[PDB]
Design a protein around this nucleic acid. Structure first.
Ligand SMILES: *C1O[C@@H]2[C@H](O)[C@@H](COP(=O)(O)OP(=O)(O)OC[C@H]3O[C@@H](n4cnc5c(N)ncnc54)[C@H](O)[C@@H]3O)O[C@@H]2S1
Ligand SMILES: [Zn+2]
Lengths: 289, 78, 112, 93, 107, 95, 83, 93, 105
DNA sequence: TGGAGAATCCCGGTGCCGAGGCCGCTCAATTGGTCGTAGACAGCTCTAGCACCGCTTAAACGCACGTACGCGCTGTCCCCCGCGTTTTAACCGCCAAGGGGATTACTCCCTAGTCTCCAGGCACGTGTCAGATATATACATCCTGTGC
DNA sequence: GCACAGGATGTATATATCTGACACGTGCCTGGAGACTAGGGAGTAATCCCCTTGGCGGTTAAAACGCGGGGGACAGCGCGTACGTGCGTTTAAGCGGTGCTAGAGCTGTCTACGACCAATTGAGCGGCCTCGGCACCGGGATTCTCCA
């Protein structure tokens, strides 16, 4: 649960700490999740966006909220943490999304969190776009290959993690040897080209994309659901805080992401798997009926 | 005829090297260093040519001069 | 005479074995040259060239091109430490230099 | 005139390792010069080694020692491995 | 920049120092020789004049000389820049070149 | 007592005028044997071999320190620091 | 028989003598570990080359000519031991 | 077996130039190694010169060119002059 | 006289030089004029270095020549130093010199 | 400016291990002669180095202005240096064992040297495809006008 | 003031056109492969003894540790100006033509010369002894340090 506030850079122009945690009335929230379910159950191209609110239930604090790491670092000095990425237990939402992908309803997923709990939950790596990155992944500096490890690499700013590449070329040549740099973007750093392109294509193709656990204040990550509804498509912004694009939001919720998703799956008749260790899987699992 | 190496040329060479600013007195020193290097390499090449009883300074002669001075040069055959 | 199967085919190399044998003999390296020296030398040269070419092709593919050029060889060399050591004294023509900018030279961001 | 070069063998190796990729003429010349230089270095070291031990011949052993002396790092290990495999296959034939 | 941006929150004369950085980025990604061929060829002719008169130079010979000298000077300037950085500076001066050569063994 | 620095020049003059082997012989031999243990086991160095190794190492270190002192003095200093050794080893192509 | 961490044998006064030979007037404290590392690297190189020569010669003793040949190879030709 | 060294002729030169000076065994060994190294340099450069031009004989011309390529200005001039004088006095008688 | 070295105005062994050239694996043929030249050059270089070393010895109040004298002779002469840049003379020491700023002021 | 000292240059006595000379001789340098060919010399040609021109125009050159840097001065502090006592281990002198280097025969297998045969590798001819430049087109973001 | 909407800036994609270098094809020839023999380079085993390893013991030279002070490393701040950047004027580099011929490369012929060999002898090396240069030790006189 190390914070990516001092790790990113001292420069932090958040300017957002007064965040009234608006909550919806139970009946209004029920109706809003009902209509969202009615839309999604028929919407074909569905791509989600998970922010640093899903893992708050896991135990790792969010960034902007009243308990946000940046918020506390701004007003006084009191960063409180409970859990660790290594011990980070997946939230029920990660398994919900895994099941949604399994049944094929969830066309794509573009998260911006950093704990990689989606990767650890078995979500096909070919379907995610860890735009900001993932601790449990170090990418080679020569062959641009990835290695989903089991223990955090332990570095920030796209720097060496102390391991050389171990991919063997043919013709008994020397194995490629690159730094296996880390994947977390510092302020003023470019995004992974492949992941960003896949996310853009998915979001554009998405006639209905719902963005969770994110304030969407951040670069591109919060802009994908703008282009999801531009050129058609409806946007569902499920978050507690007022998002930077509520005025453009085609839907809104004020409630717990876990609870709203649980109600959605209950209405759909859908169930949720129950976490695991680092049971990582890459190939897209076959769609289910 | 030495001044043919204009200040922009040395500036471009430095920019390739990695330099960010260039003191105004560098250019003369760089010209002198270039003259010394060319004098040595040309003397070796011309000796190689004169030995082979040739009036022309073949490219391979310059390549062998460089190889002798521990600056083996590729791409010119040899 | 039976079919003339060149030494390289038997050895399995791609470089010439007989050619290197003749180069060693006429190169004035020893009063006589073993029967296995050409094979070993050819294998070593083929492996070294294979390494350089493979790395250069990697650089080319990473540069969106299909014709290896001296720049690709320069990049394939200076970026691999062992080859840079072995080729420390060479100056591959038309190779340029690696894109190195010292950190102290870079500007200081976090303005505004 | 009759000029000698390793161009054909270098191209064969390239098409063996990179099924679809060309190589410029200047690049081919650079590769050929590299092969020539490495050959000269290894041969000279093998000759000096044969002279030090008062032997009058060059053999796989001397070439192996020259490769060990010259190439650094994993380069030497893998070059020695390839040379040994080549010579053992050739001797078996 | 199609939907791509760096990590952030959102939102004439160049400051002396940025145009030089752009120049560095430009010339360290190219490969063409960075000296005018005709004046350099005249220089090579003048230098070889002092040794043997009426000496004809192959075009490839002058090209090889130019490549060698360009590589040598680029390396020398790299080392001079390193020395200047070592001395808590950014502008390379003659003393930096002299020290670089002195350590290199040429001086 | 002597003001600090004055006997540094005295030691410089003395140890430059002389020609002996500065490092102690037995520890150097032990270091060399420990190093050689890495490559092949149970070697047997001729005394002349270790003498030559020590001569080479002493000459190399003396030259390296002369270069390092030049670097430090260029840096407007009188005390040679590790950064000076790194610079000298870098401008000479080592490492 | 298995020598350990003998690099410490190169003591502070010895390195100070070596530096004094080079014309140094003052020596920072951190210089000593750096110099020990540099000497260790140099000795690793020379001993590797000498052991290569010896093992090639089918001998088991590192004759002085082995070290002289290694130094000549590394561009550090040494006079006073033959060759 | 008996070994070969340049000690005797180094002694001859020393007495010729410094008729009242000796030389220690260490200095003799240093001179022997130096003479071996200089001879090796000159002869190797001569062999390279011969190989470059496809010649097959290391004639006095090869040696002269090698000594001009190796030694610096004044040293090279004096060495080449002495070599030419020696060859002239030899072939003449 | 009978010996080649004697017929030339040399003191070095011409026969040994020729034998080493022939057996040194340098070329298939070795000119009959090459040994004279090579021996003359070796003799000249030995004469030069020994002359400088003897001068150093005499200036050092020593009746002989010791490796230190050879080191001083080599390093104190620019041409020989350039010829002998990459050599180290065991027991030779280092040429005495100090920086221009570390001296007392 | 002057006065006491640690360290240094220098004079006299001298005896051991290393320089220097002696000498037998045994393998290497020398003389003379034979034979093949590697190179000296002469020719022919036609590749390509050289010289010159006119037009484009990319780059070089001169100046002007400002700020970013170099430089110098001043003030901690802290990090070496010098000295004196403890102590730690090199240094030397000698002795023993035995490995491993060095030389010696017997020999046997491998490489030099030939000759014959001929497919691999070159020089040239040809087709065309990758790469360079220019055009148009679709979509993100920035600047500005209008409406909330 | 923020947001909706349009104009503009800037980017990546599809496309077209062109050009000279690159891939494939072919005939031509000579350098490489197969079969062969002869002899000597260097395996291999045996033997000898030089030198490396190892140990011990005493004196004791240099390393180790501590302690104080003072020198400079390093940071900060302030002032001058030198370099970076921009612009407009110059100039000579680039390119493409021709037109010329020095001499680079190939060939042809022949002889001077290096390899080789046999037979001769002499000089440079291993072991022999003799003599002294300078390391070492005693003291007498001297030069920057430091202090005053
Ligand atoms: C570099 O990487 C970081 C990462 O990519 C994100 C982290 O923040 P975002 O995910 O962009 O926004 P976030 O602060 O998470 O906004 C979501 C809001 O949701 C609140 N929240 C907490 N727990 C929630 C549940 N269970 N349901 C709904 N909302 C919930 C958060 O407190 C926050 O207000 O960008 C940076 S930059
Ligand atoms: Zn890799």
């Amino acid at each position: 649960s190390v914070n990516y506030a001092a790790g990113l850079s001292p420069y932090a122009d958040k300017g957002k700490c007064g965040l009234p945690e608006i909550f919806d009335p139970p009946e209004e929230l029920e109706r809003k999740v009902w209509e969202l379910a009615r839309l999604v159950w028929q919407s074909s191209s569905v791509v989600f966006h998970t922010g640093a609110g899903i893992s708050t239930a896991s135990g790792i604090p969010d960034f902007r909220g009243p308990h946000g790491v940046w918020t506390m670092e701004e007003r006084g000095l009191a960063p409180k943490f409970d859990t660790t990425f290594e011990s980070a237990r997946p939230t029920q939402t990660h398994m919900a999304l895994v099941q949604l992908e399994r049944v094929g309803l969830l066309r794509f997923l573009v998260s911006q969190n950093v704990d990689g709990l989606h990767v650890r939950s078995g979500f096909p790596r070919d379907k995610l776009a860890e735009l900001h990155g993932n601790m449990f992944v170090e990418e080679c500096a020569k062959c641009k290959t990835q290695y989903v490890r089991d223990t955090v690499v332990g570095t920030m700013g796209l720097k060496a993690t102390g391991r050389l590449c171990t991919v063997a070329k043919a013709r008994g040549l020397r194995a490629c040897r690159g730094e296996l740099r880390d994947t977390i973007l510092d302020w003023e750093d470019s995004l992974p080209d492949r992941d960003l392109a896949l996310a853009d294509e998915a979001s554009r193709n998405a006639d209905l994309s719902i963005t969770l656990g994110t304030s969407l204040q951040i670069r591109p990550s919060g802009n994908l659901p703008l282009a999801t509804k531009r050129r058609g498509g409806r946007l569902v912004i499920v978050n507690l805080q007022p998002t930077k694009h509520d005025r453009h939001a085609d839907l809104r919720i004020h409630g717990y992401v876990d609870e709203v998703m649980t109600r959605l799956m209950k209405h759909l008749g859908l169930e949720i798997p129950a976490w695991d260790g680092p049971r990582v899987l890459e190939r897209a699992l076959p769609p289910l009926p | 005829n030495i001044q043919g190496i204009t200040k922009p040329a040395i500036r471009r060479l430095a920019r390739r090297g990695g330099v960010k600013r260039i003191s105004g007195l560098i250019y003369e020193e760089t010209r002198g260093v270039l003259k010394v290097f060319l004098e040595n390499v040309i003397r070796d090449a011309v000796t190689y040519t004169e030995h082979a009883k040739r009036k022309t300074v073949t490219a391979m002669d310059v390549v062998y001069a460089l190889k002798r001075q521990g600056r083996t040069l590729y791409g010119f055959g040899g | 005479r039976a079919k003339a199967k060149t030494r390289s085919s038997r050895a399995g190399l791609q470089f010439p074995v007989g050619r290197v044998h003749r180069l060693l003999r006429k190169g004035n390296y020893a009063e006589r040259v073993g029967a296995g020296a050409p094979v070993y030398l050819a294998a070593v040269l083929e492996y070294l060239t294979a390494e350089i070419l493979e790395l250069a092709g990697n650089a080319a593919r990473d540069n969106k091109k299909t014709r290896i050029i001296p720049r690709h060889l320069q990049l394939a060399v200076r970026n691999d430490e062992e080859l840079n050591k072995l080729l420390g004294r060479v100056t591959i023509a038309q190779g340029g230099v690696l894109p190195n900018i010292q950190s102290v030279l870079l500007p200081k961001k976090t303005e505004s | 005139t009759r000029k000698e070069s390793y161009a054909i063998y270098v191209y064969k190796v390239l098409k063996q390792v990179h099924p679809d990729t060309g190589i410029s003429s200047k690049a081919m010349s650079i590769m050929n010069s590299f092969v020539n230089d490495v050959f000269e270095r290894i041969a000279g070291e093998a000759s000096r080694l044969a002279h030090y031990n008062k032997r009058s011949t060059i053999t796989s052993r001397e070439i192996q020692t020259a490769v060990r002396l010259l190439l650094p790092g994993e380069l030497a290990k893998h070059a020695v491995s390839e040379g040994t495999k080549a010579v053992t296959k050739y001797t078996s034939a | 920049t199609k939907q791509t941006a760096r990590k952030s929150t959102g939102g004439h004369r160049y400051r002396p120092g940025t145009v030089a950085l752009r120049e560095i980025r430009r010339y360290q990604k190219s490969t063409e020789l960075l000296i005018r061929k005709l004046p350099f060829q005249r220089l090579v002719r003048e230098i070889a004049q002092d040794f043997k008169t009426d000496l004809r130079f192959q075009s490839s010979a002058v090209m090889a000389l130019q490549e060698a000298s360009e590589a040598y000077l680029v390396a020398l300037f790299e080392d001079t820049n390193l020395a200047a950085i070592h001395a808590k500076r950014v502008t390379i001066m003659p003393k930096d070149i002299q020290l670089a050569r002195r350590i290199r063994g040429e001086r």
